[PDB]
Design an enzyme around this catalytic site. Structure first.
Site, PDB file in Angstrom:
ATOM      1  N   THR C  37       0.864  -1.213   0.000  1.00  0.00           N
ATOM      2  CA  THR C  37       0.000   0.000   0.000  1.00  0.00           C
ATOM      3  C   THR C  37       0.890   1.249   0.000  1.00  0.00           C
ATOM      4  O   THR C  37       0.622   2.153  -0.812  1.00  0.00           O
ATOM      5  CB  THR C  37      -0.971   0.012   1.187  1.00  0.00           C
ATOM      6  OG1 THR C  37      -1.623  -1.257   1.249  1.00  0.00           O
ATOM      7  CG2 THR C  37      -2.008   1.108   1.082  1.00  0.00           C
ATOM      8  N   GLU C  61     -10.617  -2.891   0.347  1.00  0.00           N
ATOM      9  CA  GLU C  61     -10.842  -3.189   1.787  1.00  0.00           C
ATOM     10  C   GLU C  61     -10.690  -1.895   2.593  1.00  0.00           C
ATOM     11  O   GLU C  61     -11.661  -1.506   3.267  1.00  0.00           O
ATOM     12  CB  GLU C  61      -9.857  -4.255   2.274  1.00  0.00           C
ATOM     13  N   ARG C 193       9.508  -7.173 -18.772  1.00  0.00           N
ATOM     14  CA  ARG C 193       9.322  -7.419 -20.224  1.00  0.00           C
ATOM     15  C   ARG C 193       9.650  -6.125 -20.982  1.00  0.00           C
ATOM     16  O   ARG C 193       8.932  -5.127 -20.776  1.00  0.00           O
ATOM     17  CB  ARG C 193       7.892  -7.889 -20.501  1.00  0.00           C
ATOM     18  CG  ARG C 193       7.579  -9.288 -19.991  1.00  0.00           C
ATOM     19  CD  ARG C 193       6.313  -9.807 -20.644  1.00  0.00           C
ATOM     20  NE  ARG C 193       5.745 -10.967 -19.964  1.00  0.00           N
ATOM     21  CZ  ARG C 193       4.444 -11.176 -19.754  1.00  0.00           C
ATOM     22  NH1 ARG C 193       3.543 -10.287 -20.145  1.00  0.00           N
ATOM     23  NH2 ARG C 193       4.046 -12.273 -19.132  1.00  0.00           N
ATOM     24  N   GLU C 285      29.440  -0.188  22.025  1.00  0.00           N
ATOM     25  CA  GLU C 285      30.042  -0.999  23.119  1.00  0.00           C
ATOM     26  C   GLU C 285      29.875  -0.281  24.466  1.00  0.00           C
ATOM     27  O   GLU C 285      29.484  -0.954  25.438  1.00  0.00           O
ATOM     28  CB  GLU C 285      31.525  -1.269  22.850  1.00  0.00           C
ATOM     29  CG  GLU C 285      31.784  -2.168  21.649  1.00  0.00           C
ATOM     30  CD  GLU C 285      33.184  -2.769  21.573  1.00  0.00           C
ATOM     31  OE1 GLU C 285      33.969  -2.589  22.531  1.00  0.00           O
ATOM     32  OE2 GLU C 285      33.485  -3.445  20.566  1.00  0.00           O
ATOM     33  N   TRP C 298      41.259  10.753  30.254  1.00  0.00           N
ATOM     34  CA  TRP C 298      42.345  10.820  29.241  1.00  0.00           C
ATOM     35  C   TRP C 298      42.724  12.277  28.941  1.00  0.00           C
ATOM     36  O   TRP C 298      43.678  12.478  28.160  1.00  0.00           O
ATOM     37  CB  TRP C 298      41.943  10.047  27.977  1.00  0.00           C
ATOM     38  CG  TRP C 298      42.259   8.584  28.052  1.00  0.00           C
ATOM     39  CD1 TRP C 298      43.379   8.030  28.602  1.00  0.00           C
ATOM     40  CD2 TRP C 298      41.474   7.485  27.551  1.00  0.00           C
ATOM     41  NE1 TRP C 298      43.344   6.669  28.490  1.00  0.00           N
ATOM     42  CE2 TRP C 298      42.191   6.306  27.848  1.00  0.00           C
ATOM     43  CE3 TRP C 298      40.248   7.375  26.883  1.00  0.00           C
ATOM     44  CZ2 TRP C 298      41.722   5.043  27.504  1.00  0.00           C
ATOM     45  CZ3 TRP C 298      39.784   6.124  26.542  1.00  0.00           C
ATOM     46  CH2 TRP C 298      40.513   4.974  26.851  1.00  0.00           C
ATOM     47  N   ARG C 415      51.737  -3.108  25.771  1.00  0.00           N
ATOM     48  CA  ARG C 415      50.990  -3.003  24.491  1.00  0.00           C
ATOM     49  C   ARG C 415      51.956  -2.465  23.432  1.00  0.00           C
ATOM     50  O   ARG C 415      52.878  -1.718  23.799  1.00  0.00           O
ATOM     51  CB  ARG C 415      49.758  -2.104  24.640  1.00  0.00           C
ATOM     52  CG  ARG C 415      49.083  -2.179  26.003  1.00  0.00           C
ATOM     53  CD  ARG C 415      49.419  -0.982  26.883  1.00  0.00           C
ATOM     54  NE  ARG C 415      48.384  -0.566  27.826  1.00  0.00           N
ATOM     55  CZ  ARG C 415      47.081  -0.434  27.562  1.00  0.00           C
ATOM     56  NH1 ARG C 415      46.583  -0.681  26.360  1.00  0.00           N
ATOM     57  NH2 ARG C 415      46.262  -0.042  28.521  1.00  0.00           N
TER      58      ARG C 415
HETATM   59  N1  LIG Z   1       5.359   6.482  10.081  1.00  0.00           N
HETATM   60  C1  LIG Z   1       5.993   5.319   9.937  1.00  0.00           C
HETATM   61  N2  LIG Z   1       7.301   5.235  10.286  1.00  0.00           N
HETATM   62  C2  LIG Z   1       7.930   4.062  10.143  1.00  0.00           C
HETATM   63  N3  LIG Z   1       7.458   2.905   9.688  1.00  0.00           N
HETATM   64  C3  LIG Z   1       6.164   3.021   9.351  1.00  0.00           C
HETATM   65  C4  LIG Z   1       5.382   4.150   9.442  1.00  0.00           C
HETATM   66  N4  LIG Z   1       4.095   3.879   8.999  1.00  0.00           N
HETATM   67  C5  LIG Z   1       4.122   2.614   8.653  1.00  0.00           C
HETATM   68  N5  LIG Z   1       5.351   2.044   8.848  1.00  0.00           N
HETATM   69  C6  LIG Z   1       5.728   0.665   8.584  1.00  0.00           C
HETATM   70  O1  LIG Z   1       5.202   0.301   7.327  1.00  0.00           O
HETATM   71  C7  LIG Z   1       4.119  -0.652   7.478  1.00  0.00           C
HETATM   72  C8  LIG Z   1       2.956  -0.207   6.629  1.00  0.00           C
HETATM   73  O2  LIG Z   1       2.776  -1.149   5.550  1.00  0.00           O
HETATM   74  P1  LIG Z   1       1.450  -1.078   4.652  1.00  0.00           P
HETATM   75  O3  LIG Z   1       0.355  -0.401   5.408  1.00  0.00           O
HETATM   76  O4  LIG Z   1       1.795  -0.593   3.284  1.00  0.00           O
HETATM   77  O5  LIG Z   1       1.085  -2.628   4.567  1.00  0.00           O
HETATM   78  P2  LIG Z   1       0.907  -3.550   3.277  1.00  0.00           P
HETATM   79  O6  LIG Z   1       2.267  -3.867   2.746  1.00  0.00           O
HETATM   80  O7  LIG Z   1      -0.110  -2.917   2.382  1.00  0.00           O
HETATM   81  O8  LIG Z   1       0.268  -4.859   3.940  1.00  0.00           O
HETATM   82  P3  LIG Z   1      -1.276  -5.253   4.189  1.00  0.00           P
HETATM   83  O9  LIG Z   1      -1.990  -5.015   2.875  1.00  0.00           O
HETATM   84  O10 LIG Z   1      -1.267  -6.705   4.596  1.00  0.00           O
HETATM   85  O11 LIG Z   1      -1.774  -4.341   5.285  1.00  0.00           O
HETATM   86  C9  LIG Z   1       3.848  -0.741   8.984  1.00  0.00           C
HETATM   87  O12 LIG Z   1       3.491  -2.071   9.336  1.00  0.00           O
HETATM   88  C10 LIG Z   1       5.179  -0.318   9.615  1.00  0.00           C
HETATM   89  O13 LIG Z   1       6.074  -1.390   9.821  1.00  0.00           O
HETATM   90  N1  LIG Z   2      43.632   6.798  33.037  1.00  0.00           N
HETATM   91  C1  LIG Z   2      44.309   5.735  32.613  1.00  0.00           C
HETATM   92  N2  LIG Z   2      45.610   5.596  32.968  1.00  0.00           N
HETATM   93  C2  LIG Z   2      46.281   4.520  32.536  1.00  0.00           C
HETATM   94  N3  LIG Z   2      45.858   3.516  31.772  1.00  0.00           N
HETATM   95  C3  LIG Z   2      44.567   3.684  31.443  1.00  0.00           C
HETATM   96  C4  LIG Z   2      43.746   4.729  31.809  1.00  0.00           C
HETATM   97  N4  LIG Z   2      42.476   4.557  31.277  1.00  0.00           N
HETATM   98  C5  LIG Z   2      42.548   3.429  30.610  1.00  0.00           C
HETATM   99  N5  LIG Z   2      43.797   2.849  30.679  1.00  0.00           N
HETATM  100  C6  LIG Z   2      44.257   1.608  30.068  1.00  0.00           C
HETATM  101  O1  LIG Z   2      43.808   1.583  28.735  1.00  0.00           O
HETATM  102  C7  LIG Z   2      42.627   0.750  28.618  1.00  0.00           C
HETATM  103  C8  LIG Z   2      41.496   1.584  28.074  1.00  0.00           C
HETATM  104  O2  LIG Z   2      40.731   0.799  27.142  1.00  0.00           O
HETATM  105  P1  LIG Z   2      40.612   1.282  25.620  1.00  0.00           P
HETATM  106  O3  LIG Z   2      39.242   1.819  25.372  1.00  0.00           O
HETATM  107  O4  LIG Z   2      41.767   2.152  25.265  1.00  0.00           O
HETATM  108  O5  LIG Z   2      40.756  -0.141  24.909  1.00  0.00           O
HETATM  109  P2  LIG Z   2      39.797  -0.901  23.884  1.00  0.00           P
HETATM  110  O6  LIG Z   2      40.689  -1.570  22.906  1.00  0.00           O
HETATM  111  O7  LIG Z   2      38.749   0.047  23.412  1.00  0.00           O
HETATM  112  O8  LIG Z   2      39.086  -2.013  24.790  1.00  0.00           O
HETATM  113  P3  LIG Z   2      37.712  -2.826  24.506  1.00  0.00           P
HETATM  114  O9  LIG Z   2      38.038  -3.879  23.476  1.00  0.00           O
HETATM  115  O10 LIG Z   2      37.281  -3.427  25.816  1.00  0.00           O
HETATM  116  O11 LIG Z   2      36.738  -1.797  23.993  1.00  0.00           O
HETATM  117  C9  LIG Z   2      42.390   0.147  30.008  1.00  0.00           C
HETATM  118  O12 LIG Z   2      42.026  -1.220  29.882  1.00  0.00           O
HETATM  119  C10 LIG Z   2      43.738   0.328  30.712  1.00  0.00           C
HETATM  120  O13 LIG Z   2      44.611  -0.755  30.482  1.00  0.00           O
HETATM  121 MG   LIG Z   3      -2.271  -2.847   2.486  1.00  0.00          MG
HETATM  122 MG   LIG Z   4      36.734  -0.095  23.029  1.00  0.00          MG
END
Ligand SMILES: Nc1ncnc2c1ncn2[C@@H]1O[C@H](COP(=O)(O)OP(=O)(O)OP(=O)(O)O)[C@@H](O)[C@H]1O
Ligand SMILES: Nc1ncnc2c1ncn2[C@@H]1O[C@H](COP(=O)(O)OP(=O)(O)OP(=O)(O)O)[C@@H](O)[C@H]1O
Ligand SMILES: [Mg+2]
Ligand SMILES: [Mg+2]
Ligand SMILES: Nc1ncnc2c1ncn2[C@@H]1O[C@H](COP(=O)(O)OP(=O)(O)OP(=O)(O)O)[C@@H](O)[C@H]1O
Ligand SMILES: Nc1ncnc2c1ncn2[C@@H]1O[C@H](COP(=O)(O)OP(=O)(O)OP(=O)(O)O)[C@@H](O)[C@H]1O
Ligand SMILES: Nc1ncnc2c1ncn2[C@@H]1O[C@H](COP(=O)(O)OP(=O)(O)OP(=O)(O)O)[C@@H](O)[C@H]1O
Ligand SMILES: Nc1ncnc2c1ncn2[C@@H]1O[C@H](COP(=O)(O)OP(=O)(O)OP(=O)(O)O)[C@@H](O)[C@H]1O
Ligand SMILES: [Mg+2]
Ligand SMILES: [Mg+2]
Ligand SMILES: [Mg+2]
Ligand SMILES: [Mg+2]
Lengths: 458, 458, 458
Positions: C37, C61, C193, C285, C298, C415
């Protein structure tokens, strides 16, 4: 935009940001025991004990008395609300039904309406026209209805005659999928005409409070962060962590079996109770009886802390419930006791024969809730290989990771502790040797001679 | 809430949280030879052999004579009970006519329990209308009925016409899934309108006692834990464990083939019969013949202990029965012999071509029961590689792990033992070499000249 | 050739090579809530809001009032257009009668575009004969019609009676496949087509703007490439890269957990806000809270930059939306804020339980867009093992790779960083050790005493 109505169902209002479209009818199809009746009852009940809105319930199979008795197990009476004149159980177990139902709407302030169920009413060409008439006739009255239909397959057709889906404005599928001899309740919104909603299935459970939908997509990264430190239970470990753990942080204790994960958990939990702070211990590998003996041997009284109402112990097997249930159990127990610290011993045991994604979606749920309630979570993880990598990609959830590995030295087994991560803090980047005694652990110096650990010995 | 009635079927009273809803009927569907009729009889039987409640039995295809003849197999006379008046088998060689006869017989003996086996004989739109009328006429009489349905697919439609589930208040499905040419009985409660139940499939067996449901979920982590220690058969091993094994503990002896796991099992059982204590040996790799020869070769008379009624040997191939049977066989034998020490040789053999889920749930069921029966258990595990890890995640179940491995030294194959872990006890953290002779284990000293053995190759 | 008409739906004008065949009808089948629709309205709408072409709308409908009420949601008034004369919603509450009314209304407003939603209501041998007669009477009037069909299976028969595809000149299928409890909208052209089109499924989303098709195929390898360099936040790192990163380039910071990937992202964004340049931080994360604490720790005030409108932080869980959404969210936000630097933390988190195909096509869509928008992008990747490779084959997308890894030395966890590769630039080919402090990265000198680090264990 289409005005939504709050159903007051924990989670459902997030899944459909607002609730159900006002003036239109929502179709809730599902296999037997999916919670169709419960949803439709809970919808009307919530709308009467929060917005005092006169709702009407239509019956087609189960008798009114049965619906009243069944709903009594959730801790709410329908006959009392029927006595007040706030509910109406229209017993019906063609066109006049619409006019009769419409009559009550105008004669009892048309708020919310539920029809459980229509499949037996029209028990596939005739189905469409008959279902198209009702919805249209319910649109004219402009009351919010919920229709419950039945389906045969969980991932097969939406409904029994496979036509209702198009005829309805809103489509809600309740699933009871069985995987590895275990039933997993999920609710998804198939569509919402002229509105936005969350797509995909969402795990939910049924308890004494009713349907408890647990949205994972509504969980946002807003977990407030502080520089408040808290003692891990080991003075040497607190120095190694540059003051000790962060109050708003998730500590991870990974290692091989018999390395001292439970020890660190015990000592972390004791510390809370020393400072008169509440703590919960979630055991899945050990029992309370074995935990009390084990702690006792290290010189820590777990009964004493239990008698002071500062430490609680919840022991249960992972396979004794589901991840959805386990999470709810944690939240419920946390909601009551409201602890300062928490310990899960362990996630490794909770990942035993479970969808790698079903477990991944559980960890976020527990991690997020702990962070969102300002509770220090310490989760243990036993490595499959003795003497090491995460091999799960879930190290992005934990803010601190304590490594515990064995170091085979001079034909003698010795243990070793090390801190990998300490986000927002300095940590000692050394592999200090530690051992276990009757007074707990003792962290000594590192091995300057052997530089080849996380592998073998020299 | 909804009042439940005890069926007195081992496990069903826990899975149902209490039993079957009182006043309402329960539908039991399943393929042929699942145990529908059995569950049907056993329900009514225990009714009149416990709570002494007169229950009537409706038989459509099977004749009363056959029902009694089959029932006898389990060990209970029905004709005697028919003779007295506690049970009445209403032979069914229109609904209103049959309903009348059932209704006129439910007041005669004032029957509390009712079973209809089966309703899939008399007979999609008409089945509903008939079934609805049947449960309605049984609901009015307030008699706990049990209706048996019939299905064609194991994981397909719940019933035949897939409409008997929405008409029933309760739905119990009995399965007989075949996986790798092996038949596994499973029982699940689909829904219980009103009360709560345990969700998911639960393994069950049929023996002389009748249905035997083994709920792994109902089993809580409430396992008594004492500091009472016991010997292992080896003085040095007891000293290495820091006084010997704990009475209430699970010990694991894992290692490569021919390392001496059976030797440790033998001595473990011998020591029991030394202190005039009863033990059981569950062999799945070697026969009584070979065991007696090997034992006698090691200086341990297994005939003597057998004659002293202190040692019971039970050998049987791992593929000679299902984990379900093996578990039920272990429990049955334990209850008969009432032993203080139990040894299984081995778990690895019991995992031979078996799903990790079905094996996981079997080790929990064995370890859990032994722990709750105050029985010391030594389980052996043969590693795939000669020179390893902990198989899977069964290290969370063992409270003690005795690793045994080979150490190629100067072109010689010497064996090494070490207590890898011991919860609640100090243990020797040294990798001591040990020899084997006709006297048993010879634990000598560790290898300080080379520190790279353990779980490595050097 | 065959003249095509522009639908003005973002992506459909590229997938169709130009749009829908002029004079002929297009069939749009899909399950319920696919966007049939919507596509139907959006087609006619853009007709009268771009090329100002009067289009009539047939409703079977759904009533006009509902169509307008739903249409409003996206943000466009239909009743206003109905009021003027640019659109006429022909409510359909025999073919010849209906065809006459449509044919008599196609000449009244001289409608160029026509939509029939839906033809699966009025209604295998008869459907063909009716459908054939319908397209024949619309072909004669030379009006670009769009017919909406209905299907039951996602990858099953194209239409209901599986005969509407051979009668139609054009076939557009809208899918809503559920994979791991996640709903993914996809649009495919089956055939056209006469003209040519793009073969295969193409991911699309529905937002406030309407349907948003993201053709990954239409995206050509035409990406402007300059020798303009920029800083990274680290002087030594800029010098190590041979003058700093290229303005038009994709940088990748991969390594084990806690190596300092987020540190490099922080400084990268800080440096942007230093030169009064706008940047965006996409966190998946950690939260704003933790980021601000970690940043502040930092020596980088993320509040300041936030207040200076030079830095925009957007945190959200990877499982809180689909790759489709995450991509559309990134593009939307970029277009609003118009940033010069973008950093994603991280891709590894965005690959959490997601098909390698769906993830592969997302990284191409992000890197491609940033490269064509002249935006410098630093993407982080957390390796599964602490001590590795390049995850999958995403190394063909990154123009620069900054590897960071640990080096156990004398029982210390230091490291190490190194520019692994840099296209179009010289880079330092040395593995220099670096420390972290409250001031940021401290890149020192390399380890000449031991040459076995890099992607190895020494
Ligand atoms: N404002 C909006 N923002 C984000 N998503 C929306 C918004 N309005 C509708 N949707 C999404 O799009 C859908 C609308 O689909 P639509 O009314 O075209 O259905 P359809 O494909 O005709 O199916 P049917 O004929 O079985 O009702 C909603 O179910 C929703 O997931
Ligand atoms: N103020 C600080 N002084 C010293 N070392 C620090 C300090 N803050 C953080 N660290 C060190 O650096 C790290 C910071 O994590 P960082 O975000 O740099 O790593 P990352 O690779 O993003 O880790 P992850 O995979 O968990 O996201 C800590 O684990 C610690 O070993
Ligand atoms: Mg419909
Ligand atoms: Mg990280
Ligand atoms: N007190 C309770 N605690 C927990 N779960 C409960 C409780 N009461 C009911 N339930 C659960 O909710 C279910 C109620 O079934 P309900 O009637 O809501 O399902 P349904 O999908 O409408 O079934 P159907 O339409 O096939 O009759 C029970 O089967 C049980 O699984
Ligand atoms: N009283 C004690 N005295 C000395 N050492 C002890 C004592 N109790 C336990 N230990 C040692 O510490 C270990 C206990 O570690 P803990 O109970 O924390 O297990 P874990 O490392 O979590 O492993 P798993 O959970 O797999 O059992 C024992 O295996 C033993 O080596
Ligand atoms: N004495 C017994 N010891 C062990 N198992 C038994 C014994 N008697 C019966 N069984 C097992 O139980 C089954 C009996 O099932 P039952 O007669 O209840 O069938 P049912 O489930 O009613 O199926 P159907 O109606 O198709 O016959 C036998 O097939 C057999 O596997
Ligand atoms: N009388 C004996 N004297 C010396 N060594 C012996 C004697 N009997 C057995 N052995 C040695 O001990 C081993 C006995 O096997 P044992 O049952 O102890 O090992 P296992 O780990 O159970 O082996 P498997 O994995 O095959 O069951 C022989 O392979 C041999 O090396
Ligand atoms: Mg119901
Ligand atoms: Mg432990
Ligand atoms: Mg039978
Ligand atoms: Mg053996």
């Amino acid at each position: 935009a289409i005005a939504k109505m709050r159903t007051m169902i924990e989670g459902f209002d997030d899944i459909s940001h607002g609730g159900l479209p006002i003036g239109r009818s929502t179709l809730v199809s599902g296999t037997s025991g999916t919670g169709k009746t419960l949803f439709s009852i809970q919808f009307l009940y919530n709308g009467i004990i929060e917005f005092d809105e006169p709702g009407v319930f239509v019956t087609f199979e189960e008798t009114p008395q049965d619906i009243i008795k069944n709903a009594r197990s959730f801790g709410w009476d329908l006959a009392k609300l029927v006595d007040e004149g706030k509910l109406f159980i229209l017993d019906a177990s063609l066109s006049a039904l619409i006019e009769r139902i419409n009559y009550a709407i105008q004669k009892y302030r048309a708020r919310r309406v539920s029809i459980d169920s229509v499949t037996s009413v029209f028990q596939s060409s005739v189905v469409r026209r008959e279902l198209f008439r009702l919805v249209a006739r319910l649109k004219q009255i402009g009351a919010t209805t919920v229709m419950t239909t039945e389906r045969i397959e969980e991932y097969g057709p939406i409904a029994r005659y496979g036509v209702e889906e198009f005829v309805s404005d809103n489509v809600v599928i309740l699933r009871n999928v069985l995987e590895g001899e275990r039933r997993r309740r999920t609710l998804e919104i198939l569509k919402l005409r002229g509105t936005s909603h969350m797509k995909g299935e969402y795990p939910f459970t049924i308890t004494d409070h009713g349907i408890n939908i647990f949205p994972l997509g509504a969980m946002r990264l807003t977990q407030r962060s502080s520089n408040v430190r808290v003692s891990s239970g080991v003075v040497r470990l607190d120095e190694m962590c540059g003051g000790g753990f962060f109050k708003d942080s998730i500590i991870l204790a990974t290692g091989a079996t018999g390395t001292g994960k439970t020890l660190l958990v015990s000592r972390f939990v004791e510390n809370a109770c020393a400072n008169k702070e509440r703590a919960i211990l979630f055991a899945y590998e050990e029992s309370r009886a074995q935990l009390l003996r084990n702690a006792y041997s290290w010189g820590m009284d777990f009964e004493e802390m239990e008698r002071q109402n500062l430490l609680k112990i919840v022991c249960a097997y992972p396979e004794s419930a589901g991840l959805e249930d386990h999470l709810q159990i944690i939240k419920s127990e946390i909601n009551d006791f409201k602890p300062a610290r928490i310990a899960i011993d362990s996630l490794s045991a909770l990942a035993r024969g479970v969808s790698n994604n079903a477990f991944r979606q559980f960890v976020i749920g527990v991690t997020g809730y702990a962070k969102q309630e300002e509770i220090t979570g310490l989760f243990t993880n036993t490595s499959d290989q003795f003497m090491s990598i995460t091999d799960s990609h879930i190290a992005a959830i934990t803010d601190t990771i304590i490594l515990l590995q064995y170091v085979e030295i001079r034909g003698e087994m010795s243990r070793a502790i090390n801190v990998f991560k300490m986000r927002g803090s300095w940590h000692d980047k050394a592999i200090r040797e530690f051992m276990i005694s009757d007074k707990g652990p003792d962290i000594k110096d590192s091995f300057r001679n052997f530089e080849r650990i996380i592998s073998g010995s020299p």
